[PDB]
Design a protein around this ligand. Structure first.
Ligand SMILES: CO[C@@H](C(=O)NCC[C@H](c1ccccc1)c1ccco1)[C@H](O)[C@@H](O)[C@H](O)/C=C/C(C)(C)C
Ligand SMILES: [Mn+2]
Ligand SMILES: [Mn+2]
Ligand code: NA
Length: 304
């Protein structure tokens, strides 16, 4: 394998962490290949659930608990902290909230969150690498509570970063927020990628094509598919009651991705940095409710 930049995996990984059996588990957690039979049963449908009142309450809850766990992780980002140490803290914080860490064993993903540094686009596997001053790191949290999943991410700065890092992270966050600002009933899912790409391209960045936002509720990934690039052909129209994520990955160089031999870590083919933000959104009559927003602070963590 020829690595595309300076990052390398730092092995061995810690043995898989158990979740006590009093915590409710999603279907894939005990499938040997981590397959979700409830998702597979819906693979080839473009149909989108209209959430009931009960479902919306269940989503509001799990998404606020997910935000609290991302905030725990944010508090730990400093030079010399390993991404495994962040994942251990995340795993305990989900269990403290009587939630299961949705990524764990999802298609046999081996950890409880994703930690993506620098050229990693997404799905990085927490490992023994200490964070370095100058890194950008994304921590991606998903919790499962009472049958519902809540999913969010932010990119963070590890100590002092260069100007390129600052601009890429800021632009990525703005891409996400301008797409959220367009969400309301009657808008096509395919429109968000036009917005995101327009703003990324204005800043000299590119938009990853291989990974998309998605419906989420009782299933971790379901309809709609929500691409982040322009002129995509996604199917569907937003209605009050739809819940889904927007999670753009924007890159300093070209958009092309590849995956590491671990079968998870997605990286820029050119080795240049990539940043991402994600929120879980519910469409309301007035636009949308950001289920995974901060309730106690105006800005994302990188802007402190
Ligand atoms: C970019 O990452 C997302 C993803 O893989 N989005 C792809 C979604 C997918 C998809 C499928 C085919 C092509 C492109 C996207 C989809 C949409 C609707 C149904 O399935 C995940 O949703 C991410 O936010 C989550 O935190 C990490 C999850 C793992 C446990 C998997 C690491
Ligand atoms: Mn996520
Ligand atoms: Mn997601
Ligand atoms: Na990255």
């Amino acid at each position: 394998y020829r690595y595309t930049g300076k990052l390398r995996p730092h092995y061995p990984l810690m043995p898989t962490r158990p979740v006590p059996s009093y915590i409710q588990r999603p279907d894939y957690a005990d499938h040997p290949l981590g397959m979700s039979e409830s998702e597979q049963a819906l693979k080839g449908t473009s149909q989108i659930k209209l959430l009931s009142s009960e479902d919306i309450e269940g989503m509001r809850l799990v998404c606020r608990l997910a935000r609290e766990v991302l905030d725990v992780a944010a508090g730990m980002i400093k030079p010399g902290v390993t991404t495994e140490e962040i994942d251990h803290a995340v795993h305990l914080a989900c269990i403290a909230r009587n939630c299961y860490p949705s990524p764990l064993n999802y298609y046999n993903f081996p950890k409880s969150c994703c930690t993506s540094v620098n050229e990693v686009i997404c799905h990085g596997i927490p490992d023994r690498r200490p964070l370095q001053e100058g890194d950008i790191v994304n921590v991606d949290i998903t919790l499962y509570r009472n049958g519902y999943h809540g999913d969010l991410n932010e990119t963070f700065f590890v100590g002092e970063v260069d100007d390129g890092a600052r601009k890429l992270v800021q632009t990525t966050y703005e891409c996400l927020m301008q797409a959220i600002d367009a969400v309301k009933p009657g808008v096509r899912y395919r429109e968000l990628g036009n917005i995101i790409q327009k703003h990324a391209q204005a800043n000299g960045f590119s938009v990853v094509r291989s990974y998309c936002g998605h419906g989420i509720h009782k299933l971790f990934h379901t309809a709609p598919n929500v691409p982040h690039y322009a002129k995509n052909k996604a199917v569907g129209v937003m209605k009050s009651g739809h819940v889904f994520t927007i999670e753009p990955m924007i890159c300093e160089g070209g958009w092309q991705d590849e995956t590491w031999p671990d079968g998870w870590t997605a990286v820029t083919r050119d080795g240049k940095r990539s940043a991402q933000f994600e929120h879980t959104l519910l469409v309301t009559d007035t636009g949308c409710e950001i289920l995974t927003r901060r309730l106690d602070s105006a800005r994302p963590h990188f802007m402190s």
